[PDB]
């Protein structure tokens, strides 16, 4: 059987509350192989062996942890044969694109959440970690970049997004569906992203201790700048905006950022809008401006890419070109 | 024929380029006719009536557009049959859903936009329009509240929003559904929204002249809480914080908010999840620390409602019994 | 606490199989009561009474369970607060739209599946049963007609249909969208269906004993005529055809439909796309054929409607006024 | 510029009725030419070359017409830069993928209809056929079989599905997703189909004058055998059956094909369910009774492999492994 490691850090799918009615959750609740031990079936399809990174709500998610399980990733490759990443599924779609720009492992590394405490009824978590370690252990899961394993689909790191509140099937890559579908532990893969990841970016974080300042500014009717003005005179690197349609920016926001452009700022253009991209021919002309235009990428994944780009330049048209290309 | 006033706001409806090839769309491009002689099949269905109240971007849209576009309606509601409002589709939802609380007349108030510059093969504009009309002169459009017409779909200013940074389909109902589809002509009504509306809110902006300050902070990993402080600092009357998952917030912008919340500041939860509700009952302890869930208004939309909230109270409890009636 | 009858019909809510690895799932496998201890949180909020009506997987349901499902539901009203109908959910959609349609109780009435064996882990069965229970014990789930409970989630009967062959989230109202959203036993209505239901239906099958005899065809390139012919020589009261597109057929359909519809065979045109409406106002003339457009209804549904109608009338003219109506 | 072949088989794509009003729109109404006038943009991206295979509306679609453009194209592969083929909206989704598993050029080649009538306002038409152009020029098309442009959107032959009636936005793939987004004549191609397709499949239809006979048969609750069995005593090579859930039968549907599976003929389990693979791992065990599951494809795609399988093989056990690689 495959030798699948499992990296937690805690999250609801290691976590509930006291009773099935009612429970008081907050950010995480039990070690690791509780989590290995509660899902007895694992013993027949692999290996496991865990190790807790840490135990926070992803909503807490920042870049040390991310800094670490990138260079733990790269560390333990040759180790072990797939990796499976319990995470809170908050900022899961985060942290997922950030290790997709910076695992330089192509063995298979799996992220799984669960919407529902352990201690409701019909949890799903169980299920979700189950299917996790299959695509793990499966051949055929590797080269793919980081995976997002939830509800039985295989979503990639890049394009997958929380798209509701509380639903189970919350999951999606909105833009260009998932890689593929499990059904009774076999996966039906028809997908594999085209973008660049993992071992073939340019980024690699194994001595860094810290990332870039990007900061995420929001726009809306009678926007106001100070947010932007905030992150500004705090002397951040880049700043990704949270546009209107496609891209656009409230006057007010759209000054201030087209000022902190000239000083030296990195902007990126992204929208509040769900879905689509955020393309360079438009209303706004970033070529003037210096502006670069976020494409698929939400705001939460645009500023990802940003700090990671920020690492290895400052030039707008090169920012571009990086967006163009992972 | 019923007597339908058009009240152009600008946006693309109205605008276009030079060429089908390559346009230079900025924020309009003409008049109010000009948006009634392309479409001479109107003057089969009603007589249309123009006036031009601004002509910007909805990108720019801003308290004073609303309060007049708010009064102007009010006071023309027993002169005419019916409203059409021509507006930029990227702030769309956000002047709907205000109008939706604000006018006070009952008879139809339908907005609508286009995706397509009408230099563009396949403009959507004039069909948009066309059906706009169409639904204003229908009797049955009365009593809906203000609503929104879009790609043959009538849709509430409540529960609409942008999907999509380009297409023609972009706009839906996410949590609830449209209230009726359009052909030719011939518009099939099946639903109503429950939540009370236009006559029937508390809200009446007759004689204000501006509108509480209500700013929207982001919710990511590793957030900074400058923007929710520069905010606070600034002496704003509420702040909607566009939380991960859930309406959760990260430690820092949790701790600004909490802080502010004392101080007297209107703090609403809300995600940037694009569906479901922001519950009362989940990680955080609203009654607590005197936080307002915003249940599955977004965080642009919740802005909308505690604006008006404010105007007439600022107990968190009432608030808050506030978001679970509008 | 309210007293809630539970009518039960089989499926896969009452059934698994040996283990959690592998399952010999079938149609049933377990009585009533099962599904009352399995869940003993219901003694806190229902007094719940059970009764076996039958137990098969949907895929064989038929006429006779629905007359009886009908028939005992409309004598047991007034003897119980709400009813839940568990229920297999290949057919669901078919049964919810018919007990939609016969049921005279106004009291709430929900009908409730499950996608996974009990045996599975991370079951929805237990969740499920919970929450429709919640459902028919709520005050206003009363008068809405009949209910599907899936997910969290509260849709009507006659937009509900099977989206997925799957996923635990496969349920879903695809044309006008659900009614309301349930969390934490609570229950947020927003909407709530137009269409006449229930006691507002001129159809009661108190003494019918059988249903007319309706077919359904179905439309792709190249298409047969042989299963529209032979349904014809077998003597059916109606057809319903599933069109490609806006309900249109394929010549040789079309050429024996055409002759059935003179000879008095009730016709109606559906569509296998899975969402929009059957219009009246497109390729067919429907008005010189005898057909009648389903609407929205899709293929299966409309047999439901078209049953019903032929139990009253057999004019296309009327029959059409009764899809525009229920 | 490209030398882009167009192949015209009629459609909405080529024909309109009256006036913008009312039109009276049958199945087509204007040759070749008349679509290349119409968008005079064109003859600045490419050399456009017509020719006028057929004009019918895809509801009258046919084995031959699909043999012809199989043969056609192939044929002309090496004379032409890429192919355009205007079709009608209703079977596209079946013409695409017959084509996707039988051509044998690798070169560009795209499907592109309408849903609105030329008559129209803001009809679709004329951008979809730039687009679709545009599509076929780049280089980048190349190797992904056969696509559909529509919506701005490029789709692959097999996923693609018409979803609404109506809508102009109705083509999706509503399993995997699409290919591609165009934007300003830009394609951002971001997947690309893992099944094998055109030059690599064993398929091959030049010597071939007709195509094996399958038929397809619908279920539902209380469904009649009689379809089944006229497909049957006609002597139908192969039948598909439009299972409800997971290629689930009704008892009268299923005896019947489990006979008819003994004497020689070919059953493939498929769903009316839109969304979602028939698995062979269900309740039916496809192994006992000599039927194959679908997987992914739905009823009218499952025929079109059906007919191809049938020309090389009547084993379930071979016909099966086909469902699985294309
Ligand atoms: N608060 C939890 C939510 C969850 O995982 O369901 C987290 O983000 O970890
Ligand atoms: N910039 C335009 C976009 C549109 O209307 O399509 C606006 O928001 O008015
Ligand atoms: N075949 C079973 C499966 C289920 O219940 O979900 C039925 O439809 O009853
Ligand atoms: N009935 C026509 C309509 C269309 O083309 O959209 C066809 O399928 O060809």
Redesign the interface.
Same mark, same amino acid.
Request: negative net charge; charged residues 20%.
């Given at each position: 059987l495959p030798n699948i490691t499992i990296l937690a850090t805690g999250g609801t799918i290691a976590g509930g509350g006291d009773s099935?009615?009612?429970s008081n959750?907050?950010?995480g609740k039990v070690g690791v192989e509780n989590l290995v031990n509660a899902?007895p079936?694992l013993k027949?399809i692999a290996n496991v062996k865990g190790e807790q990174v840490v135990n926070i709500?992803?909503?807490?998610?920042?870049?040390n942890v991310?800094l670490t399980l990138a260079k733990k990733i790269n560390t333990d490759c040759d180790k072990t044969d797939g990796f499976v990443i319990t995470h809170?599924?908050?900022?899961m779609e985060?942290?997922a694109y950030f290790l997709d720009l910076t695992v330089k492992c192509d063995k298979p590394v799996v992220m799984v959440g669960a919407m529902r405490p352990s201690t409701?009824?019909?949890?799903?978590?169980?299920?979700?970690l189950?299917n996790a370690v299959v695509t793990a252990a499966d051949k055929a899961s590797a080269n793919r970049g980081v995976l997002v394993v939830m509800?039985?689909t295989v979503l990639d790191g890049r394009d997958v997004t929380?798209?509701? +509140? &509380?639903?189970? %099937?919350?999951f999606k890559?909105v833009?260009?569906?998932?890689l593929g579908?499990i059904?009774?532990g076999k996966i039906?893969?028809?997908?594999?992203?085209?973008?660049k990841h993992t071992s073939d970016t340019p980024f690699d974080v194994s001595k860094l201790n810290e990332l870039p300042?990007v900061?995420?500014?929001?726009?809306?009717?009678?926007?106001?700048d100070?947010?932007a003005?905030?992150?500004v005179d705090?002397g951040?690197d880049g700043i990704v905006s949270?546009?209107?349609?496609?891209?656009?920016?409230?006057?007010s926001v759209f000054d201030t950022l087209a000022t902190a452009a000239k000083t030296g700022t990195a902007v990126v253009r992204s929208?509040?809008?769900?879905?689509?991209? +955020? &393309?360079q021919? %438009?209303?706004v002309d970033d070529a003037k401006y210096g502006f670069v235009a976020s494409?698929?990428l939400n705001?939460?994944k645009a500023?990802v890419l940003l700090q990671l780009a920020l690492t290895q330049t400052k030039d707008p048209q090169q920012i571009q070109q990086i967006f163009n290309q992972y």
């Open positions: 099935a009615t009612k959750f907050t950010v899902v079936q027949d709500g992803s909503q807490d998610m920042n870049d991310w809170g599924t908050d900022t985060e942290t409701s009824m019909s949890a799903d978590g169980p299920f979700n189950y509800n039985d929380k798209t509701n +509140t &509380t639903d189970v %099937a919350t890559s833009n260009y569906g998932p579908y059904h009774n039906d893969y028809q997908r594999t992203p085209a973008r300042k900061g995420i500014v929001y726009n809306y009717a009678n926007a106001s100070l947010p003005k905030a992150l705090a951040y949270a546009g209107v349609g496609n891209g656009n920016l409230y006057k929208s509040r809008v769900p879905t689509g991209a +955020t &393309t021919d %438009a209303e494409g698929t705001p939460q500023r």
